[PDB]
A paper describes a structure:
The eukaryotic genome is packaged into chromatin by an approximately equal mass of histone proteins, which provide a foundation for modulating gene expression, maintaining genomic stability and regulating DNA transactions in general. Histone octamers composed of H2A, H2B, H3 and H4 core histones assemble variable expanses of ∼160–240 DNA base pairs (bp) into nucleosomes, the repeating units of chromatin. Here we show that nucleosomal constructs with cohesive-ended DNA can be designed that assemble into different types of circular configurations or continuous fibers extending throughout crystals. By introducing DNA annealing as a site-specific and directional driving force, cohesive-ended nucleosomes can promote self-assembly into well-ordered lattices with a variety of possible configurations.
In order to depart from the closed nature afforded by the 169a constructs and also reduce the interaction degrees of freedom available to mono-nucleosomes, we wanted to establish whether multi-nucleosome conformation is sufficiently robust/predictable to foster more elaborate engineering approaches. The 338b lattice and dinucleosome structure are nearly identical to those of the 169a nucleosome pair, with the 338b DNA blunt ends even stacking against one another.
Residue numbers in the entry:
A (entry chain R): 30 to 125
B (entry chain N): 29 to 125
C (entry chain P): 9 to 102
D (entry chain L): 18 to 102
E (entry chain O): 36 to 135
F (entry chain K): 37 to 135
G (entry chain Q): 14 to 119
H (entry chain M): 11 to 121
Amino acid sequence: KRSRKESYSIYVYKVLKQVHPDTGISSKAMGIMNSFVNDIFERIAGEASRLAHYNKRSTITSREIQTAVRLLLPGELAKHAVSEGTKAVTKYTSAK
Amino acid sequence: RKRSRKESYSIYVYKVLKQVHPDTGISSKAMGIMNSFVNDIFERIAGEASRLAHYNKRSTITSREIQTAVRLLLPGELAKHAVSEGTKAVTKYTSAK
Amino acid sequence: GLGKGGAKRHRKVLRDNIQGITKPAIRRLARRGGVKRISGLIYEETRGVLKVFLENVIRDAVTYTEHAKRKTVTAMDVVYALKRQGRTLYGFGG
Amino acid sequence: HRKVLRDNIQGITKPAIRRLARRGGVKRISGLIYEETRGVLKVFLENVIRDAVTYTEHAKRKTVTAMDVVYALKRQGRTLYGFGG
Amino acid sequence: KKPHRYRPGTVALREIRRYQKSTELLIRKLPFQRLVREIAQDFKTDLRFQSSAVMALQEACEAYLVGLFEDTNLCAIHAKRVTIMPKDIQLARRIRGERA
Amino acid sequence: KPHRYRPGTVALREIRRYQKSTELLIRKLPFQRLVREIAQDFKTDLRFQSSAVMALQEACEAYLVGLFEDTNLCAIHAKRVTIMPKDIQLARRIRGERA
Amino acid sequence: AKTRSSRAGLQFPVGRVHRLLRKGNYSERVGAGAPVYLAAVLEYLTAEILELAGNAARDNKKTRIIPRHLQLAIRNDEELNKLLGRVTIAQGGVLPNIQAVLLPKK
Amino acid sequence: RAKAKTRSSRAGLQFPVGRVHRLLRKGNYSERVGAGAPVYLAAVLEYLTAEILELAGNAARDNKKTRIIPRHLQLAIRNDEELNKLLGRVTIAQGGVLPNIQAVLLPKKTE
Ligand SMILES: [Ca+2]
Ligand SMILES: [Ca+2]
Ligand SMILES: [Ca+2]
Ligand SMILES: [Ca+2]
Ligand SMILES: [Ca+2]
Ligand SMILES: [Ca+2]
Ligand SMILES: [Ca+2]
Ligand SMILES: [Ca+2]
Ligand SMILES: [Ca+2]
Ligand SMILES: [Cl-]
Ligand SMILES: [Cl-]
Ligand SMILES: [Cl-]
Ligand SMILES: [Cl-]
Ligand SMILES: [K+]
């Protein structure tokens, strides 16, 4: 009956199982993965928030996420990230 | 449709300039620098204040978050004066309802 | 599509202008920074570093320009880019 | 004595400062470095602890948490993964 | 009668004093403007620039370089030189984290 | 016999050893006592989560190791192999930690 | 068999991300694509680091990733290293690296 | 209806309390803003503004000028330990640098 503290750890596990099904992760390693997701969430959302504000928009859309991603990630990482983000939105809106 | 309005802190900068140095004025560019400065420290304070309230599971930015933000952002002597001036203003404001 | 770089119109193609960052100008910059004596290797090295600096600020500035759907880079675009790169500038807006 | 018990700073031993320098690839070490490092470590902890404790007071707590330190490290441009970010 | 001639360093020190008292941009404006336009072509064709955006850029470059030369001057002096060299610039940028 | 490594050889062995491992290099209790001392100048009768003291230790050690790398480069830049206080000073001035 | 994440083809929680954007003081409103895209990017980066760190764990005959494997992954990748250039990974150490002037002759 | 007093005037301030309140609400900082917050923040911005203008004014006077320019702001800031720290990562257009020549570069003989 303690706090109820959310984290990305179940999702980190799921991704780990996709990419390396027979490997596991220490709890400190999971903590660092958790730290990482929060850090990059914040960086991206913060830049997106700024992009919208600079442009007098009230809405953060996937286009603000994408520009935020181009500003924030290094070249190759950003091409792939953009590509995975797009693909996910395309796949999401077509689905239903 | 003259030419849409652009806010600035320059009337207030001028007023404070007259309190501090009655016979001194200020160039357009210098004014531009003062405007930049005010918006910069606004964002820094408000952002740290935003963070304080978020870490503490609060929806409201109060004078207390402004104060802690100021203590984190400003170096010693500036911070003491700023805390003093913001304490005076709130107190005054509150007593004048 | 017909027209390539001249699809969009009227002659704005660029030179090799890095050499317009001259030795004397580089020496004035170093002077303001207190430097008294200068190896002959410094001039071409500074051009490199200047270029890298501008590539990075301009890339971000132009990103802000494309996001706003404009074709004109603004002082604010640059200002926002400079802030991002931890090189905050005062006197041009923001 | 008050050499370690109110300059606990001396508990940062010469051997420990060399180990740190070794992990930083340092081969040889001037004898004046151990005092210099102690000054530097203290300034660093002063700055970080000041901010953490400010987070602690604002939360009306008497116990400094890992999150206080993490937030403090982040303000100082010194982001840390693994302690609850 | 020899012509007048200052010894090496004397005019350098004079120039240091001169430019440290002034604030005027030290790179010539047109060449810098072309340089900016040329670099931006790599990211997007047929861009216009506000004049103030170009001035912003020049202000930020010059301040960046004056700052780096300060650090570079320190790196030369640390190695008991008075002459700044590429390895000085390289050390300062590496310590700054600009470079690996 | 006098079997003896030359000056420098054990240093390099130590470098290889500490670069391979990830354990904290400052002893824990002395570090912890330092934290509590420094903290008292800001507020009395403060308590500390253990993970807080560990977070502080991790950050400090990471800081010092990274500062020793830059210091090493500054010594080498001056054609030495021996880090000196003026090397730390120069690293810190260029990093903008000090004026 | 639908959940926002499944539609999008993702492991990361689109709904959670959506909620975090909305309550995070970023903007008045958040469009429906934003959290899909954002959760996609977070998963992509998470996958890269875990692919590499999983490899580093294998290379050292271990079945579990530990902070060192994460550190080895990140610091030997030129672009992850830049993205995380002002980040300290607790219990990660540093990369083996000794300046050449310090090595003995041959 | 009473005749209206600015929140600034009740606070004893030159800086716009009401504008600051508005900028806090519309800046995406929190869901709600307390009545004290913009009063406090407005005061702090006034104090810091006053402090820079005090010192730049002195720099202007020292230069035999009536008007502050960007250089006076730069001279003020950089010569002040505390402002220099606050604005340590900030670039002041047309400000220049502080006169500073490293001792080793001055010629043989001293001071
Ligand atoms: Ca980029
Ligand atoms: Ca006065
Ligand atoms: Ca700011
Ligand atoms: Ca000599
Ligand atoms: Ca040990
Ligand atoms: Ca990669
Ligand atoms: Ca491999
Ligand atoms: Ca005041
Ligand atoms: Ca005053
Ligand atoms: Cl060289
Ligand atoms: Cl020394
Ligand atoms: Cl959207
Ligand atoms: Cl309030
Ligand atoms: K925000």
